[PDB]
């Protein structure tokens, strides 16, 4: 009543290595181990080997010594239990004469997640720190947080923070960097101590620290200034006249996070704004993926102080190499940035755009022409003019979206465009989309007076009804009515059928209603209905768009942040 084949510790893989591990020649042990981790990562099971591996500990040559480590390393978060069993080995390693080593012993100790860890490492930590080497300090600085984040802190722990700060500004090389952030992150779990970052002296520490190059540092530093500045001017002018190099300097992250503050702090202004210009720009001649985030922020930016690049735009055009998201945002922006002197070019470009091949694009693109005309009333026709201009191309897809837009246009500037109507219908077949068709229809309805044919057009769709997007079924109904109320005597049978279909031959509650509703309005008092339906129609309002006040100010803080992209509050992320 016992069975387990292919599971002998007499031979095979496991064994093979196991032995070849304990041999002599330092070489074997080395390679051997290597295969281990390897053979590990791919997904095999090394639960076994563990022992004999560690016990390949009491050796020396870095080579081996570290490999061993890595191994253990992986086992970090996975099976912490095993990690621990190595403790002693580490502590006792902390003292080793090769900081490199003892440092690793640190970082290592630190990548565990169990409570039992507190006991064994703390003391050695303090030590390792105050000690004498770059890596050493850095590394533990890091740890600190790790310990913090551990499922618990201590009354000693809340005493290491001091170590931090003090040791922070002090020890000089990159170290500080780590320290900084270390704390920063720690801070956010905000009791009090995170709020005493209020020194217009501790700041100069940071000041010279920025010019003491560790990009990552540069950031973390700025990243902190995002918790400051209550009330004074001379300090502002120096804090900022100090960041001026930061922009033209290194890698985005910098420039960005840098800006992140420049704007939380705001003959003063003109200096900033005319400098802030060439930075953001050269920020885009950079790379694909980044470009996004920035644009996203760029957006948020002009939203607050548009005055910054009020005329810089011969750049925000979309090239072909540029990926989709790129393009998208680029648009959204261009838009939030046009006026008279602008539009001239704006359109010129949109037109070409539309000509492109990437569908989606052209779409939002034409749709751009749309929002465009809206913001700049003073440029209505102008747009239209080109819209129409495109449809004359009979490029199936373009066409439809186009119309759609035009529709919306009419909603805002009624009885101002007509002639365009006939020229419109022209392409009636080629329109196979919902809203597209829909829209089209509803249009006819409204401006029925003009088109004689009105009838058949609408009619056309009928025979092929009982099936077409809900929404379209609607207007179509509505519309019909409309012209019927333009009194045509010839409308009888039509309207009749219409309702009729949308009366009993249809199975969409809502529909049935708006349907019946009319059937009663008419079966009772035409004159009445007339005024009713085609009644003086109100003005439209989609001011619901283009960011808010309270919210705007608040966001700018998180540039280079996730929020920096969603344009939303940490409340939606945090879970």
């Amino acid at each position: 009543t016992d069975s387990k084949y292919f599971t002998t510790t007499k031979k095979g893989e496991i064994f093979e290595l196991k032995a070849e591990l304990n041999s002599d020649k330092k070489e074997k042990k080395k390679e051997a181990v290597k295969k281990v981790i390897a053979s590990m990562t791919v997904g095999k099971d090394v639960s076994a080997l563990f022992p004999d591996v560690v016990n390949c500990m009491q050796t020396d040559n870095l080579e081996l010594k570290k490999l061993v480590y890595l191994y253990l390393m992986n086992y970090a978060k996975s099976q912490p239990d095993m990690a621990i069993m190595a403790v002693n080995t580490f502590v006792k390693d902390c003292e080793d004469p090769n900081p490199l080593i003892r440092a690793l012993a640190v970082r290592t100790m630190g990548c565990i997640r169990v409570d039992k860890i507190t006991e064994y490492l703390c003391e050695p930590l303090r030590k390792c720190l105050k000690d004498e080497d770059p890596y050493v300090r850095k590394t533990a600085a890091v740890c600190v947080a790790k310990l913090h984040d551990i499922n618990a802190q201590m009354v000693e722990d809340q005493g290491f923070l001091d170590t931090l700060k003090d040791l922070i500004s002090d020890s000089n090389p990159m170290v500080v960097a780590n320290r900084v952030a270390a704390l920063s992150e720690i801070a956010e779990s905000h009791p009090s101590s995170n709020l005493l970052d209020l020194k217009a002296q501790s700041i100069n520490k940071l000041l010279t620290a920025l010019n003491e190059c560790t990009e990552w540092a540069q950031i973390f530093i700025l990243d902190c200034l995002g918790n400051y500045m209550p009330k004074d001017d001379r300090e502002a002018q120096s804090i900022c006249e100090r960041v001026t190099p930061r922009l033209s300097h290194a890698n985005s992250a910098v420039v960005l996070s840098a800006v992140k503050v420049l704007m939380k702090f705001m003959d003063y202004y003109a200096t900033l704004l005319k400098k802030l210009a060439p930075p953001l720009v050269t920020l885009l001649s950079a790379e694909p993926e980044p470009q996004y985030v920035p644009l996203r922020n760029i957006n948020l930016i002009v939203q607050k102080r548009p005055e910054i690049l009020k005329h810089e735009m011969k750049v925000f055009f979309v090239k072909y190499n540029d990926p989709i998201y790129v393009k998208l945002e680029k648009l959204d922006i261009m838009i939030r940035l046009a006026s008279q002197a602008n539009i001239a070019q704006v359109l010129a470009e949109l037109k070409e755009y539309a000509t492109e091949v990437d569908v989606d694009f052209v779409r939002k693109a034409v749709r751009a022409i749309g929002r465009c005309a809206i913001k700049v009333e003073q440029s209505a026709e102008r747009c239209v003019s080109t819209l129409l201009d495109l449809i004359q191309t009979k490029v199936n897809y373009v066409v439809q979206e186009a119309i759609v837009v035009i529709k919306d246009i009419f909603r805002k500037y009624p009885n101002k465009y007509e002639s365009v109507i006939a020229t419109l219908c022209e392409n009636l077949d080629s329109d196979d989309e919902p809203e597209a068709r829909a829209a089209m229809i509803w249009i006819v309805g409204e401006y029925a007076e003009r088109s004689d044919n009105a009838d058949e057009l609408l009619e056309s769709f009928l025979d092929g009804f009982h099936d077409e997007s809900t929404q379209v079924q609607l207007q179509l109904l509505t519309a019909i009515v409309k012209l019927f109320l333009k009194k045509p005597t010839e409308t009888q049978e039509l309207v009749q059928q219409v309702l009729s279909l949308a009366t009993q031959d249809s199975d969409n509650p809502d529909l049935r209603d708006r349907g019946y509703i009319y059937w009663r309005l008419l079966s009772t008092d035409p004159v009445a209905a007339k005024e009713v339906v085609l009644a003086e129609k109100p003005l439209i309002s989609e001011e619901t768009d283009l960011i808010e006040p309270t919210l705007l100010d608040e966001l700018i803080c998180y540039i280079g942040t996730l929020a920096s992209v969603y344009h939303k509050p940490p409340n939606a992320f945090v879970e």
Binding site: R411, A439, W442, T470, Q471, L474, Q475, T478, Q504, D507, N508, P509, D510, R512, D513, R514, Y516, I517, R520, L521, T524, D525, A528, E531, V532, V533, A535, K537, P538, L539, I540, S541, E542
Partner: protein
Amino acid sequence: MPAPIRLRELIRTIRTARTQAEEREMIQKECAAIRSSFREEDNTYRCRNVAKLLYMHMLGYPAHFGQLECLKLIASQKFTDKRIGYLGAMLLLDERQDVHLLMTNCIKNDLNHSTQFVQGLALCTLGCMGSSEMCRDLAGEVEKLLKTSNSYLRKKAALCAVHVIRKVPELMEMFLPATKNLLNEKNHGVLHTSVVLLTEMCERSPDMLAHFRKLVPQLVRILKNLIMSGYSPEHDVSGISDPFLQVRILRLLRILGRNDDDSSEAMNDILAQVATNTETSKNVGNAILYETVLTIMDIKSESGLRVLAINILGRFLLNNDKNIRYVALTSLLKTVQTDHNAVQRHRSTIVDCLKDLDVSIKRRAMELSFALVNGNNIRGMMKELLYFLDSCEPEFKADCASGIFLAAEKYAPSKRWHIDTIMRVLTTAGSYVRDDAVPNLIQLITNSVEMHAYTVQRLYKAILGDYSQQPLVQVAAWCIGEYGDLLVSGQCEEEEPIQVTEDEVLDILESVLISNMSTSVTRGYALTAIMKLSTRFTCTVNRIKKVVSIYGSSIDVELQQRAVEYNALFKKYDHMRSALLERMPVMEK
């Protein structure tokens, strides 16, 4: 003048490999030198490389290279070369009739050899490649060999012939000859082969009657003998003799008694025994049963016996370990359409499976369970289906909806329930439900004129907390509209009304439009509805007019349009509102 590597040696070398690139290297360098070794066609070492190759292949590499030469081994005199060879064939061959003939050749030449294991290779190989033409050739040769009683061979042969049949239906004739005696043999091996041989044979109605009437009784005895006694150091596998043999037997018994009284009527005994007399300990046995059951099913037999069969599967379901349970369900379905009244005796436990952690089971469970929904059943099972549905995983939700609906749509008690349930489902899947729902459910409500209350009621409650959902909300908003009347703490039958402040009715509707979670269509039903209330209430007839006129300016061509429409209705021809709304028509199925 080379120094040829040896197989293992090779591999062991690829074990040293540190980089995929390198692997190529080594390999490429190997086969390269190996090719230049075949240039000469040197009889010795021939075997080796072929192997080397084999391996090479196995690791997904340039194989074709030596298909041919592989055969040139088969040629060789020395056994070895032949086995290594043959093996290589089965692996590296494309079905070229050309080699196929060369194959044929060597097969025969080998099939008639002084030694015997040679003959082994042959047979074997032939039963694994045998392409039409082949068989059409060696066919007879197979019989000549089928005869000679050297157990080892015979069994091999048997199977061969089989394979032949499979590729050349036309020839089973010449095998009638081996037939008659076969089922009397003593060595399991053969016997077994012999069986499937027979089994496969019976794919031509006539032969049936031959074996049908013949061997049936005998088969029995054999099987019986087995089951019934002794432990066997040669055959047992955890307490039973040659399960295999046992199974296959069953199978054959099964197939024979397909549709017939005589046969069956003559089997039901051994069967029953097989059932009662076997060990439920571990799988092995159960395997036995699994088969026995299937057999017991396709064949006519006392109502009492079939009953046992079923009750047996149930017995499975309740087994600690997955596996088993699977088939348990599977087969179960294939018979629900037949032994309905019989299986029912277990649903309770079946649906109880839905609680399992394995998709397959789940589904099947479901599928079936469903099917068992009776009349007097529904209520219960539904209550369970519902619990289920609610916590289910996406995949399923979708399909179940469809399911429940059915149930209710067909076998179904009260509307209140029907609705209650349908709604219920919406409440949980909606986002997954098909399209016709919205109208569906309403049509149900409208048609049955009582629960009008009970409905708007619950409808209301649900919507108060929830928002997430569309179909649901819609439906509600609907009635709320058309039914506001009744929604006002009315003299409600079927059950207990609640607090209906018109202000509240609105608050909800209002939020609906505002909150971003609703579709333009949604907002529709709403607004429209809100107005339907103007005629259906007594006092807040003002907050109403306010809203309407505000929406008169919304992006939604529709909403607006209507808004204006309504708006204007108040502003001018009031009293029409009363007659206009107060009447919702009614469509009937």
